[PDB]
Each structure stands twice: as structure tokens, then as C-alpha cells.
Amino acid sequence: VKNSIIWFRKGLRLHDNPALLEACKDAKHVYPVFVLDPHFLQQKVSVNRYNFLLESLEDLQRSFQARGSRLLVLRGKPEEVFPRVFREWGVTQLCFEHDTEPYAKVRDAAVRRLAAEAGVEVVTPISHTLYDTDMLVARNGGAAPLTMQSFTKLVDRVGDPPAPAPDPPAAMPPPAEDMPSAAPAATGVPTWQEVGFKEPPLTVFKGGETEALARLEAAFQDPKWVAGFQKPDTDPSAWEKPATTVLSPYLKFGCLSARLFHARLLEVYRRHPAHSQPPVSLRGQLLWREFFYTVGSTTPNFHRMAGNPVCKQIDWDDNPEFLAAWREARTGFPWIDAIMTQLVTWGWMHHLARHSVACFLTRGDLYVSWERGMEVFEEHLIDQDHYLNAANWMWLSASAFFSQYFRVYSPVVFGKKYDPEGRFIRKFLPVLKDMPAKYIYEPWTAPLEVQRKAGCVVGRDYPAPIVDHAVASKACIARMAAAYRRS
């Protein structure tokens, strides 16, 4: 008989799961498995993203139980767990979604070799990205495109991505009974308290495939908004109703299929001929994700500067004080500090909000390496993606892809074009809730009587600006320009 394992790493969903479909075909028993390293905090990871993962696992548990099955959360490392459950469950097939991250290639190669020794077949379909990213490179002549212009024309020559896979059957082959490594107590989904975290999560975004589909439907409730979507025109200060879809944490963990998202977009585009085109459209946003995945998976040392063939070598400053003030949201610029407070509270900010704080830390004001603020984003972002976090930080620092270092965002003026009243600032920085709007972006310019009346005295309740933007940006521009000369 056939006994299979469907190994979850990414792709925490039931819809568009060709690996799950194969595992259930002609199967007597199916073992849904997620492998959790219980010593991961003994390394970096915030409770916001880790609880998002746990909430996504609890959603899988209810979905499997509704189909007569169960999700098994095995504790330990995959290389040590799988050789045991292969013989214990009489496994003949192992299925999991393909992953192109560096650690994923080392891990999956080791489990493949262990599966061959136990006579287990390995089926690894592609469904985390829109396309077979290795196919895109081969179609382009053996090298990945380096511009969105040429990449968009590559996929247009390939055609539509594959259609989403059909839903799994209403009843699934359950795990075998009385298997010791499948005991319920050892295979349950833990809470954030049990994994070691002390402080509770504060994000307003809940994980799971169910919430992902619900937020997807809410996005397509207004087809004119989907059709005319222009990414650079959205509002970074919108927080009650965010200006974009906020589907990034669900695409990161695979709670939502990128191919289902892409198929729903094509349904809308066929009915609206004046719809927006790449790269500014919603489809173009999925293409930015596919573009950086294609470039990153074929570039060595992509998440670093040294040894990176696509990254420009700049002599960034080793300034721990600027990094600490930026990390702890005490730079003195309320627009910057409010965004960084949103980073650690929600784990998500708008794209242009990430532009403001990344430009401020790097090529704009503080001249700190993009790798340092990178590690800050990697800790708190609930949508942190190894290839997207890296490529966009190389973009904002003018180290890769982007080159117009004369475009420097202002930490004072940028947010005021969207939110002159500072409603976004008063939300995440309640110390300035009573500050008049004339000074909410420049509290240090308010007279001392205004500061006392509002209960926010600069230097006592809110810090002074760490730098003068006119002075700091003038020096940073002249240092980026000289670097590009030797480049």
C-alpha cells in the first residue's frame, strides 16, 4: 500500500497545493507534517511573525480535522526526524513544495538522500512562485534578467503562469492509528508562550489560509480598485484601511497561492480594458516578487554585500549610535519614528513607508549599511522574505537595481503630502497626540509654550533630531557620487 507524507515548510494552505494532491492520490495513509525546531530561539525572531506562523498552523489543523485528518507538528531537525518516521509509518512517498532559498537547498538535498536510502519517492512541484524560476532563466539564454523591463518581457513571451491546482478531496486518508511518533501530545501546535516568548504579539493581522482568502475576497470586492491599481500613487499613511492589499505575510508563508492571486487578476483585467499595466499594477507587484526571486536564486551571496556580483561596494559607516536610534524609534523625526514603531507593533508598513526609513538609514541621512537595517527588518516584519527583503534594501541604498542617488526623501516633507494633520503620527506616537499639526513633523520648531501646552517637551518627552537633514543628506549625496565614480 501507499503511505505518504506531505511536508509543510512554506505553502501553508490547502488550495493550489499540487504536492498535497499527489500525496493523497491512491494513498492509504497521509501524514501532514510540519517540522518545528524547538531550540530556534536559542540562536532574531519577533513574537509577531512567529505567532503568525503558529496561527497559520492552527488553521491547517482545523482544515485537516474537517477532512478526517490531522496536522502533525514534529519537534526536532528534519535530518534527524525523517529517517525515523520513514520506517515507522512505512512511508513510500514524500511530497513538499519546492523552495529556492539557500538554506532550503542544503536542507532538501539532505532529506532527498535520506529518502533514497529508505526507498521513498520524492515529488517536489513548484507552486510558491508564479513560474518555474529555473525555466525562466533557461528561456532567457541561461542568465536571469537584471531589469524589470526585460523580465516583464520574458514572462510575456512565456505566457500565463500555470493555473491554480484543484482543491483537495473532501475526505483525506488519515494517519495510521497508534503510531508513537504521531501521538497527539507530541504533535500538537504550540502557543507563543510555550515556545519561550515572554511578551504577547501586538499585530492586527492574523495568520492562516482562511484569513488569506478572506483578505483576498475583500481586495476584489471593488474591481475598479483592482483594475486601476497604481503602486506609487497609494498612501503610506493610511492605517485604518491600508492603501494596498496587505497580502505579503500570507504570500510569504504560502497561506495564499500566488497563482490564484494571478488568476483572479486576469479575470478582472479581461472585463476592464483600461486596467493598469506592469510594473505599477497589482500584477506587476507579483512580478516584482517573481523578478527578485529569479535574480536572487541565481546570484551568489545575494543577502550580503561582499561577494555579491550584483551589489555595489560602498564604504558605509560603522555607526552603532545612529543604528540604535533608528532601531529604537528615537531619531527625533516623528515620521521616521512612527514608521519604525509600526514595524515593531504591526510587523508591516506600506511600501513607501519602508522607503522612508530605509533611505533615512542608508544613502539618505545616516549612511549606515543596508545590511544592518536589514537585520532589523528580518526580526520584526511578519512578511520578511529572504529575497524580497534583500533586493529592496539594495534598491533603497542604491547598491543594486536602483541608481538615482540624487533622489533623497525628506523625513519632514514626505509624509506631509499625504497626511498634513499627522493622523498616522498621532496613532503610533501618542506622545505627540496634542501637538498642533503645524509642528507635528518638526516638533523641535514649536515654541516652548506650545510644547508645554501639548505635554511634549523636546529633549524630555520626545528626542531632538539626531541630525540636520539638510546637512546629513548633502554629505551622503557627495559620498554616494564619489563611490559611483570608481564603480
Ligand X SMILES: Cc1cc2nc3c(=O)[nH]c(=O)nc-3n(C[C@H](O)[C@H](O)[C@H](O)COP(=O)(O)OP(=O)(O)OC[C@H]3O[C@@H](n4cnc5c(N)ncnc54)[C@H](O)[C@@H]3O)c2cc1C
Residue 344 contacts ligand X per CB under 6 A: no
Cell numbers representing residue 433 in the block: 497626540
The CA distance from 29 to 89, in Å, is 9
- Tell me: is residue 384 an annotated ligand-binding position: yes
Q: Please, which residues have CB within 8 angstroms of residue 447's CB and are 6 or more apart in sequence?
A: none
The backbone torsions φ and ψ at residue 240, rounded to the nearest 5 degrees and listed phi first, read: -60, -50
Is 335 assigned a ligand-binding role in the annotation?
no
Residues facing residue 94 across a β-bridge: 5, 122
Q: Which stretch binds Cl ion (CB under 5 A): 171-179, 376-384, 408-416, 419-427?
A: 408-416
Question: Is 479 flagged in the annotation as binding?
Answer: no
What gap in Å lies between CA 140 and CA 151, rounded to an integer?
Answer: 9
Annotated binding residue 395 = no
Closest to Cl ion by CB, 284 vs 334, is: 334
User: How far apart are the C-alpha atoms of 203 and 208, rounded to whole Å?
Assistant: 14
Q: Which of residues 163-182 bind ligand X (CB under 6 A)?
A: none
Which of 7, 31, 82, 414 touches Cl ion by CB under 5 A? 414
Sign of CA dihedral 230, 376, 208, 425: negative
Can you tell me the distance from the alpha carbon of 336 to that of 345, in angstroms, rounded to the nearest whole number?
14
Q: Is residue 266 marked as binding?
A: no
Given the C-alpha cell 508564479, which residue does it identify?
Answer: 130
The residue from 53, 251, 472, 483 that contacts ligand X (CB under 6 A) is 251
Of 72 and 358, CB closest to ligand X: 358
CB under 8 Å to 3, separation ≥6 — which residues? 27, 28, 29, 30, 31, 89, 90, 91, 92, 93, 176
Q: Contacting ligand X (CB under 6 A), which of 13, 15, 49, 252?
A: 252
**Which of Cl ion, ligand X, none does residue 358 bind (CB under 5 to 8 Å by kind)?**
ligand X
Q: How far is the CB of 415 from ligand X (least distance, A)?
A: 16
The reply, when asked if residue 59 is annotated as ligand binding, is no
Query: Which of 57, 343, 388, 456 lies at the binding interface for ligand X (CB under 6 A)?
Result: 388
Looking at beta carbons only, is 128 or 469 nearer to ligand X? 128
Residue 217: CB minimum distance to ligand X, A: 14
Contacts with ligand X, 368-387, as mask; x by CB under 6 A: ---------x---x-xxx--
Please give the Cα distance from 65 to 57 (Å, whole number): 12
Q: How far is CA 369 from CA 261, 359, 361, 452, in A?
A: 35, 11, 8, 38
CA distances to 65, 159, 195, 338, 463 from 273, in Å:
43, 19, 51, 39, 51
Residue 414 site contact among ligand X, Cl ion, none (CB < 5 to 8 Å, cut-off depends on kind): Cl ion
Binder to ligand X among 4, 56, 244, 308 (CB under 6 A)? 244
Which of 203-211, 329-337, 398-406, 412-420 is the region at the interface with Cl ion (rule: CB under 5 A)?
A: 412-420
Strand partners for 450: none
Which residue is closest to ligand X by CB? Answer: 244
Task: Please give the residue ranges that form the binding site for ligand X (CB under 6 A).
Answer: 231, 244-248, 251-252, 285-286, 288-289, 292, 350-351, 354-355, 358, 377, 381, 383-385, 388-389, 392-393, 396
The annotation places the binding site for FAD at: 231, 244-248, 285-292, 348, 351, 354, 383-385, 389, 392
Task: Please give the residue ranges that form the binding site for Cl ion (CB under 5 A).
Answer: 409-410, 414
